[PDB]
Design a protein around this ligand. Structure first.
Ligand SMILES: *[C@@H]1O[C@H](CO)[C@@H](O)[C@H](O)[C@H]1NC(C)=O
Ligand SMILES: *[C@@H]1O[C@H](CO)[C@@H](O)[C@H](O)[C@H]1NC(C)=O
Ligand SMILES: N[C@H](C(=O)O)C1[C@@H](C(=O)O)[C@@H]1C(=O)O
Ligand SMILES: N[C@H](C(=O)O)C1[C@@H](C(=O)O)[C@@H]1C(=O)O
Lengths: 518, 520
C-alpha cells in the first residue's frame, strides 16, 4: 500500500506504472525504472519547480497524491477510487496527471468524469481517447495513434514491404492501434500475411506460439508491432529462444527503450521503431541524478528501484547478498532521460497554468485560493484548460521550434514522430534517429543499418525471372505467379507476353523485337 | 454528522437506492422526507427481502442482506453514496447487485459507476430512453419501460382531442429533456405545433418557475401544456401557477403521475389535469405490511421516525425544538395511506435479482442450497447475462397469471411499455385521480368519464376561430395556424375554408350555409 501524499492548497493526483504487471497471483511485479520511476520523479520535479515559481500559481502551493498503476487498468481503477473519495486523511483532487497505458487512462477516465475531475495523460496514445462524448474530462499532451498508424504504414509503403505480419497487444492500445494500421495498409496496397495478438496473463507458450506462426509465413520478413512495452519485451525474448529473425517495425510501446532488447539484442538488431517527437528536459537530468536513497525519502519506491538498478541490498530487501556501495549514483554512464519525460512535465504545467488562470479570474484580489475557488468547478476547469496555450516549461530551449503546449478540440497533442533504428556499431546496442513523420514521411535511408546488412524484402511472391517470365496476379493484389513465355514472345510489359509475330523474334532483353535473318 | 443507512448482513447482499429525502434547498444536501416514493419504496424492498428470506423455493439456503442508501433525489449525492458499493469489493458488505435509482439522472450516473466494477443494477422507476443503450449502460436493467413509448401515448392523446397548439415544459436532466425530445418528435409526425418550449432545472427557485408561468401565459391560445418533469419540479411549477392563479389543462408524464402530494395546496390550479403513470396494480400483501409499521416496531429503518413526524405533524423526543407530542395510537391505514403507484416495480426488481442469483446458485452449486465456493466471488458479467434471460411469474403478490404477469427484460433490459391515463377530479369535495384510459400500443380512453378544467373539453389551437357571418378559414404554410378572410356579401361558405359566389339571381343566406333566390 505505497503512495506519495504531499499536502498543498490544491492537490494533483498522479498515476504511473511504477511497477510492472504482477505475474500470476501477485498484482505488482518488478520496478519499471524508466517509464515508472523516472516519470514519477519528473512530476515531483515539475511540482517542485512550480512551487518555486513566483509567476505561476504564486501563493497557491501544489501538493500531490501519486499512486502506482502496476501497469494494469483494473488496478489503476481501484487505486483511483482514492481520488474521488477525496471529494466527500483524504486529499481533495483538483486534477489527475496520468495513465501511461491507454487501457488504464481509459478506465480511470470513465471514473474521473463521474466526478468532473480533469485528467491529463502524458503517454496514452489510443485514438479512442479523442472521443469527447465518452472521455469528456480527458486531455493529453501526446497525439492519437490515428497518426502513428499512418507513419508506420507509409514506412512499409516506402520500402515496398507489401507482405507483412502483424502482432498486437490485447487492450485498447494494441487493438485500436493495429486496426488503424490495417486500414492504412489496405489503402496503400499492403497485405497482412498473418495477424497475431498476445494479451492478458499470457505466458511463454502464448508468445512462443506467436513466433511459430510468424515463421509459417517466411516471405513476410517484416513484422509490424503495435504492442505494450511489457508485451514487446516478451515477444522479443520469445524470438530469441528459437533464434527467430525478422525486421521489426514497432510503435512507441516499444519505442526507444533499450530495456526491451536487453538480453536479445541480436534478435532485435536492425529493428525500426517509432516514438513521439520530443527533446530531453535538461534541468531534469540534474534533478534525477542528484537523487539517492539518502536524500529521496518522499518516493517510497526509490529503495526498491535503487536495489534493482544496481543489483543492491542494504537492510531493506529480501534475504539476499552483496550489500551496496554507498558511492553508487545515477549518472551520465547508467542513466538516460526517458523519451516521454517532456510530456509528463508539460502535462503537469498545463494543469498548473489552467488553475492559475482560473485563480486570477475568480480571485482577483489575492494570490491565494479565495473562497470563490474553495470548491472547484471541474467542468469549467476542463474548459479553461482546453483553451490553454503557453510556452513549454522553461525547460525547453528556443520558442520557435513550436514549443507551445496546447490542445486539439479533442484534447489531443500534435502528431509528430521520430523513427529510430536499433544499431550496434560501437559494440554496444543503441537507437539512432533515422527519420521522422510530421504529415509526410521523412528519413535518410543511408544511415539505416538493416538486419543481415541488406534492405529487407517482404513481398508475397518471388520476383519473376527476366529472361522470360510475365507477372500474373491471381485473385488478390499482393501475390502472383510467374509464367515463362514462348521463345518467340517478348514482354510488352511486366505482366504481359506478346507474340513478336512472323519474321520477328524477341530481343535478348525481351523489351522488344528484332527482325530475323536468313 | 450522521449519514444514515440500512445494513443487514446476509450470505448475499443487495444494495438499494431510494430518494428517501427530497433535494436539499440551498447549502443543505437533503431536505424533507419523500413519503410515497421514498419511504414506501424503501419498505417495499425490505418487504420483498423478508418474503424472499421466508420462501423455501427461492434462494432457500441463501439469506439476502441489504445495504440501502438515500439518494436525496440528487445524482451527485447518489453517486457519492454508491462509492460505498464498490469499496465493498475490495465493516463493508459485498454487493451482489444494486436495486435502484428512481430519478433517471441518478440511475444513469450510478450505472456509470457500477459498470466499472461489473455490479448489476435494476431500477424500478427510471424511464429515460438513454438507459436502453447497452453500449453505455451494459450492467443496467429495469422493470419499467423507456419513455420512447410514454412520449407516444402523450402525443397520441393530444392528436386525439386535436390539440395542435400546445406549450411544453421539461425538467433539466436525462428524464425531462430526453422525455420531451421524444414527445417533440412524436408531435411533429402528428402535426402538433409547440407554442413555447420551456424548461426548469438544477437549483431553480420561485422566479425560475414564476418566469415559466409568465411565458406560458404569453401564448393564450395554447391552453394545453405538456409536462415531462421530475416529481419535485412538477410540485414547484404547480405552486408557481397557483400564485398568479394561472390555469391550463396539464398533460404530465409519470414524474407527476398520480401523486396527490404534487397538487396539495394548489388543487384548483391542477383540476382537470391529465397525467400518465406506468400500468401497475397494487401489491396487496404490501398494504398489510406497510400498515403494520410504526415507530415502535420499525427500528431497522433509520428514517422512519422523521417520516412519522412529518406524515402526522408529530414530535416525540427525537425531533427539533417543536410542539405537539404525538398520539401513541396513530397508525398508517386505509384512511391516510395509499400504495404508491410503482411499488409493484420495486418488488419485481428485487425479485428479479433474487431469481437471477437463485438460478446461478443452482447452476454453479449443484450439491447444496448454500453459497458454495464456486460462487464465493460472483462473476457480475455472467450474473447480468443470466439475469437478462430471466422469466418468472410476478412475486406471489400478483393475482392471476394470464394478465401477462411475467417479469422479464427486453434485449435492451427494459420492461413493457404499458401506461394508464389519469384525470385529476374532485367530485366528492376531495381531489383524486381517476383512471380514464390506458395505452398499450394504441390509445384507449372513455372520454365521457373525464372531468375537464372549466367543465369544457379544452380547445388548444394556434389561431382564433373565424367569425361565422362571413369568414373563411385559411391555412398559410403550416398546419396549425390560419387566417380568417371575410367573404363578399354575395358569397356563401360551401365549406369552412371556402367562399363561393352564389351566382346570378341568388344570394347567400344569413347563415351562409346556402343560397336563396332573389326577389324583385
Ligand atoms: C519499390 O521500392 C523501392 C525502394 O524504395 C523504390 O526505389 C521503387 O521505386 C519502388 N517501386 C514501386 C513499386 O513503386
Ligand atoms: C378532431 O377532428 C376530427 C376531424 O376534424 C373530428 O372528426 C373529431 O371529432 C375531432 N375530435 C374531437 C373529439 O375533438
Ligand atoms: N503509448 C502507450 C499506450 O498508449 O498504451 C504507452 C507507452 C508509454 O507509456 O510510453 C505505454 C505502452 O507501452 O502502451
Ligand atoms: N420516471 C422518473 C424518471 O425516470 O426520472 C422517476 C419518477 C419516479 O420516481 O417515479 C422519477 C421522476 O420524477 O423523474
Amino acid at each position: 500500500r505505497r503512495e506519495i501524499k504531499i499536502e498543498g492548497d490544491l492537490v494533483l493526483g498522479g498515476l504511473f506504472p511504477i511497477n510492472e504487471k504482477g505475474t500470476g497471483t501477485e498484482e505488482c511485479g518488478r520496478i519499471n525504472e524508466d517509464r515508472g520511476i523516472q516519470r514519477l520523479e519528473a512530476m515531483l520535479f515539475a511540482i517542485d519547480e512550480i512551487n518555486k515559481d513566483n509567476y505561476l500559481l504564486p501563493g497557491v502551493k501544489l501538493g500531490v497524491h501519486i499512486l502506482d498503476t502496476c501497469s494494469r487498468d483494473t488496478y489503476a481503477l481501484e487505486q483511483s477510487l482514492e481520488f474521488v473519495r477525496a471529494s466527500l486523511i483524504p486529499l481533495l483532487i483538483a486534477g489527475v496527471i496520468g495513465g501511461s497505458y491507454s487501457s488504464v487512462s481509459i478506465q480511470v477516465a470513465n471514473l474521473l468524469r463521474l466526478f468532473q475531475i480533469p485528467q491529463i495523460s502524458y503517454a496514452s496514445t489510443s485514438a479512442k481517447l479523442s472521443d469527447k462524448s465518452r472521455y469528456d474530462y480527458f486531455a493529453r499532451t501526446v497525439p492519437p495513434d490515428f497518426y502513428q498508424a499512418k507513419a508506420m504504414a507509409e514506412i512499409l509503403r516506402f520500402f515496398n514491404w507489401t507482405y507483412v505480419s502483424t502482432v498486437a497487444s490485447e487492450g485498447d492500445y494494441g487493438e485500436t492501434g493495429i486496426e488503424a494500421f490495417e486500414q492504412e495498409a489496405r489503402l496503400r496496397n499492403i497485405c497482412i500475411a498473418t495477424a497475431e495478438k498476445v494479451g492478458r496473463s499470457n505466458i511463454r507458450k502464448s508468445y512462443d506460439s506467436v513466433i511459430r506462426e510468424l515463421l509459417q509465413k517466411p516471405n513476410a520478413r517484416v513484422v509490424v508491432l503495435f504492442m505494450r512495452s511489457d508485451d514487446s519485451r516478451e515477444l522479443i525474448a520469445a524470438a530469441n529462444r528459437v533464434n527467430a529473425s525478422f525486421t521489426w517495425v514497432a510503435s512507441d510501446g516499444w519505442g526507444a527503450q533499450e530495456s526491451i532488447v536487453k538480453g536479445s539484442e541480436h534478435v532485435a538488431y536492425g529493428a525500426i521503431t517509432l516514438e513521439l517527437a520530443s527533446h530531453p528536459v535538461r534541468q531534469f537530468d540534474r534533478y534525477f541524478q542528484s537523487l539517492n536513497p539518502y536524500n529521496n525519502h518522499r518516493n517510497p519506491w526509490f529503495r526498491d528501484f535503487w536495489e534493482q538498478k544496481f543489483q543492491c541490498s542494504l537492510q531493506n530487501k529480501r534475504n539476499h547478498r552483496q550489500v551496496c556501495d554507498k558511492h553508487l549514483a545515477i549518472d551520465s554512464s547508467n542513466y538516460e532521460q526517458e523519451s516521454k519525460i517532456m510530456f509528463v512535465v508539460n502535462a503537469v504545467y498545463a494543469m498548473a497554468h489552467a488553475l492559475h488562470k482560473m485563480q486570477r479570474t475568480l480571485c482577483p484580489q489575492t494570490t491565494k485560493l479565495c473562497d470563490a475557488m474553495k470548491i472547484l468547478d471541474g467542468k469549467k476547469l476542463y474548459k479553461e484548460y482546453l483553451l490553454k496555450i503557453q510556452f513549454t516549461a522553461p525547460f525547453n530551449p528556443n520558442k520557435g521550434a513550436d514549443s507551445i503546449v496546447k490542445f486539439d478540440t479533442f484534447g489531443d497533442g500534435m502528431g509528430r514522430y521520430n523513427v529510430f533504428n536499433l544499431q550496434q556499431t560501437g559494440g554496444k546496442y543503441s537507437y539512432l534517429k533515422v527519420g521522422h513523420w510530421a504529415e509526410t514521411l521523412s528519413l535518410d535511408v543511408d544511415s539505416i543499418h538493416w538486419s543481415r546488412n541488406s534492405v529487407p524484402t517482404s513481398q508475397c511472391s518471388d520476383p519473376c525471372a527476366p529472361n522470360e517470365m510475365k507477372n500474373m496476379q491471381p485473385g488478390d493484389v499482393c501475390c502472383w505467379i510467374c509464367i515463362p513465355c514462348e521463345p518467340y514472345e517478348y514482354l510488352v510489359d511486366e505482366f504481359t507476353c506478346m507474340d513478336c509475330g512472323p519474321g520477328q523474334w524477341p530481343t535478348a532483353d525481351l523489351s522488344g523485337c528484332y527482325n530475323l535473318p536468313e
